[PDB]
Amino acid sequence: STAIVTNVKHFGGMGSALRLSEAGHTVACHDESFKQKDELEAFAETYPQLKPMSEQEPAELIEAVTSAYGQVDVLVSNDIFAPEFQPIDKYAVEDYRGAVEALQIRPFALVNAVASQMKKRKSGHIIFITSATPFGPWKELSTYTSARAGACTLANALSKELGEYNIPVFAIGPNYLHSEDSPYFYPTEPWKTNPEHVAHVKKVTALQRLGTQKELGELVAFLASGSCDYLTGQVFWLAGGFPMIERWPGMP
Amino acid sequence: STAIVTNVKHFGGMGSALRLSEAGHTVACHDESFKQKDELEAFAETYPQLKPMSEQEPAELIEAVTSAYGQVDVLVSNDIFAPEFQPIDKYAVEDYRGAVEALQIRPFALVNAVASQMKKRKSGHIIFITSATPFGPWKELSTYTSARAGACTLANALSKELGEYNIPVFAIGPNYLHSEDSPYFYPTEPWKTNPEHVAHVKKVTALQRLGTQKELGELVAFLASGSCDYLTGQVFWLAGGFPMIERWPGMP
Amino acid sequence: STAIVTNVKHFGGMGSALRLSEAGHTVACHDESFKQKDELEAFAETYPQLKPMSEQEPAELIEAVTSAYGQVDVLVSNDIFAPEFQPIDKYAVEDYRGAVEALQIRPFALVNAVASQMKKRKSGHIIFITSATPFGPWKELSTYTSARAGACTLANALSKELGEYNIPVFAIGPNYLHSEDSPYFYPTEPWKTNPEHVAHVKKVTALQRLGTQKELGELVAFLASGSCDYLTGQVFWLAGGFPMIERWPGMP
Amino acid sequence: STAIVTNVKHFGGMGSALRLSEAGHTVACHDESFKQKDELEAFAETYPQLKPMSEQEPAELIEAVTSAYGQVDVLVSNDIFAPEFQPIDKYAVEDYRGAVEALQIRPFALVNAVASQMKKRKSGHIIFITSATPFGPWKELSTYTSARAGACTLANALSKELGEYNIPVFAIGPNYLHSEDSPYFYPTEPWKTNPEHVAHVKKVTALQRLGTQKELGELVAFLASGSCDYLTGQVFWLAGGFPMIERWPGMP
Numbered sequence A, B, C, D: 001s002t003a004i005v006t007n008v009k010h011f012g013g014m015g016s017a018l019r020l021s022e023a024g025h026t027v028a029c030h031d032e033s034f035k036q037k038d039e040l041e042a043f044a045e046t047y048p049q050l051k052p053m054s055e056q057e058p059a060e061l062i063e064a065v066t067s068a069y070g071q072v073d074v075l076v077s078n079d080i081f082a083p084e085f086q087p088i089d090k091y092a093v094e095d096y097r098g099a100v101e102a103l104q105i106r107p108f109a110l111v112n113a114v115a116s117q118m119k120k121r122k123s124g125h126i127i128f129i130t131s132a133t134p135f136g137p138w139k140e141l142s143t144y145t146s147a148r149a150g151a152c153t154l155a156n157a158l159s160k161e162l163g164e165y166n167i168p169v170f171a172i173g174p175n176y177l178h179s180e181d182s183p184y185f186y187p188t189e190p191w192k193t194n195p196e197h198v199a200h201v202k203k204v205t206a207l208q209r210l211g212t213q214k215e216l217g218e219l220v221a222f223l224a225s226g227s228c229d230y231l232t233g234q235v236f237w238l239a240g241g242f243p244m245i246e247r248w249p250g251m252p
């Protein structure tokens, strides 16, 4: 079918787009850098199987993909934001508004724009790439963490109404997901190359390693395949067993 | 100590303010209507044991209560919003922005404004009145439900950083909480007067009744008393056993 | 690889075994009925793609499969129990002991018997088929529901220690999962053939239908394939959006 | 009213009994040591406000308290077990049976024995002291952690049926709860005396300290008072913000 992957260059974007395309889907890709023709053309050349779009806004993007490929069957809202770790009193209120806009309002706007066509034909899949941070909150990241939780619940809530139209809705919350060249949020440098970082990952995850783009991609393609729609409403914690809890003194 | 209860006329406002006052606290009350001298005066006359403030914005309010009474020891963010039940595609993106501003940004702004003083003296209590909808979402209320989830997690996330400063943070998520004359969200009419509504409540809650303002107030005062700070991070589901799940055919 | 599916004739047994086999795995199958050669041979003839075992106990089963097929790479603990619905005071304490033995001790015993070999190779996958009842408890089924919760947490706890040996552990908790000819727990008759039952499923699930053995099988095969080990520790709610929560009077 | 607190000398026993008594309740106490006359009398002398009982089994205990004090209004099932940390394959299946019998079957048996009298008069409170380990499992404690999870769910499931009879059911899950002279599970020595243990607690809890018996008691008394029955079904995590999750390299 036809799929849309947002912010393709970052977070769970490449894994999702690449595997979806390998599965036979036509994959329209969005990214902030695609505003520049040079960036869009370069992407199209490197990944000829993907279909980069210049459209930036929700309604604009959904309309563009629908016109170019007929309809949108799979929506992968791969949302990102660049937060700072700050004590609550050090954040500016605008810092939270920014987090909520990028992590909650955006996915909401995308579903709001594509839901009608999916409901009319009673078919489609909606996948939010959120975060596992709500499951094990770190101190001093209240904006990003709470916004991600809003997105997770948004997906679960949406599954309740869209199920009547045979539209599954899922949320994939990753952590320690290798992002390769993207800084969102675990790039090769330094996460796979610096001792302290490698050791940190070994300590906090059960599998003692970063998750791979391949793994995220396999999950996305599996859910979008229609092989297991009954998991609708699920929030998947793609965090390799994180968080590992510190044990008592003397214990290995 | 000195407490602040927002939107006192609605939701968990009166139960919280009244019980906190009976516990001996000086309770500064906020409400949109207090912007009008006539409304504020009428409230002060009816409730001489309460201290209504005219201030509307977070910083302005925190500053006024601090100036008049010395400091803010307890913050009860009784947040409200009037959402419409709507299919995802029928909402306007602005409807979600409105829900998040009222249910997430506001409590965040209040803590952002008061956290510094609490941290400097290493004492204080923060309580968010959220919702239990995230625990059992209804179809077609995605904006309100997801926003409330963001608030619940915000409370939990804040508990992690403020604990070092001896500041407990809690979230109380009610449902079917009798709101008396307030339309937010279970007024006496029709929830205690109309047969069908009375029957609905008896079916969906384990205790088969609406929760009382007194019960909410008791919990708020208990948490604010410093009797059980070790519950910091807790999201309390004040919903009387809701949700009750429909059983198989043949089962009463 | 080599997989083991217990209680193959019931619950998620057939879906798991059939899809695992279609995936290319050698699937050893356990069932209480296989104690009778007549039943085992009858099963073997009907399903040449499966390998029914006569062994009933954990240690004996693991040893038998290891001897016959080299080793056990995938363990699918498809646990079942036949509980009665009853008020807490009407149950016999033995009724709870029985539920716990069948739903907690059994999966524990199986992992206890196969873990050492998997750890030595630093490879293997463990899947518990539990229940979604803990997520939305019905009244009067305290034994079954709580035991299933124990099994879910057992899986999550195990993922923490086995991750170090590269062994993912998952729990799939279904509800309204079509069980075809098996009475555990949603057989064709009457769940797909009686109006009241069809209507009940339509009301309590978001997708308004029973889950299929195919869907459960696809998930089991996907997890066992090694395509997404990073989901280790996950409890999957395979309940089609259940539970759907009763809305206010007047709402459709 | 009349309350029963089990294993009073350990875990949440003393805080519960002491505060319930201070609240004016007649508190019948159970403990394995009370099997010996010398132990029961020594306890009665030290704590004259408490009523130690010699009864050990659920039925006889409920009956004895009912005969002596008229009825059982509050049941505080303070369950304990002394597990060993072990890799799954190192445990004996009997070690899990032992954990489940003490942490799941026991509370179930007590409610099974007292539920009828509470239902007949439509009044009563049931509180299980479980554990917060299910919320953040450590590696190698699969027996204890999963059993405690079963108990938490048992309480939640029970709230659904007993609510109709006006009987709230709660579960209090502590961790890092100072147990003073009792080895279950954080005695003064070494948790408040050894530097490494003191440092560990300051690291893994948000409040950076052990919880007190006083705090636990305050919660139990509050819940038993009938001041906030609408919290029925709640699982309280009395863990001071635990778990604190390790942050990235460079962050303090």
Ligand SMILES: O=[N+]([O-])c1ccc([C@@H]2CO2)cc1
Binding pocket: A082, A083, A084, A130, A131, A132, A133, A144, A174, A175, A176, A185
């Ligand atoms: O900003 N951060 O430090 C950050 C850390 C982790 C995440 C994981 C992927 O959700 C996201 C953001």
Ligand SMILES: O=[N+]([O-])c1ccc([C@@H]2CO2)cc1
Binding pocket: B082, B083, B084, B130, B131, B132, B133, B144, B174, B175, B176, B185
């Ligand atoms: O708008 N609504 O229909 C609504 C219903 C229930 C709530 C409960 C209190 O959280 C809030 C809003």
Ligand SMILES: O=[N+]([O-])c1ccc([C@@H]2CO2)cc1
Binding pocket: C082, C083, C130, C131, C132, C133, C144, C174, C175, C176, C185
């Ligand atoms: O006995 N029962 O009524 C029953 C109902 C539901 C289940 C779901 C699959 O876990 C199991 C048993």
Ligand SMILES: O=[N+]([O-])c1ccc([C@@H]2CO2)cc1
Binding pocket: D082, D083, D084, D130, D131, D132, D133, D144, D174, D175, D176, D185
């Ligand atoms: O055995 N243990 O090591 C243990 C550790 C912590 C607990 C906390 C109270 O639940 C219980 C048992």
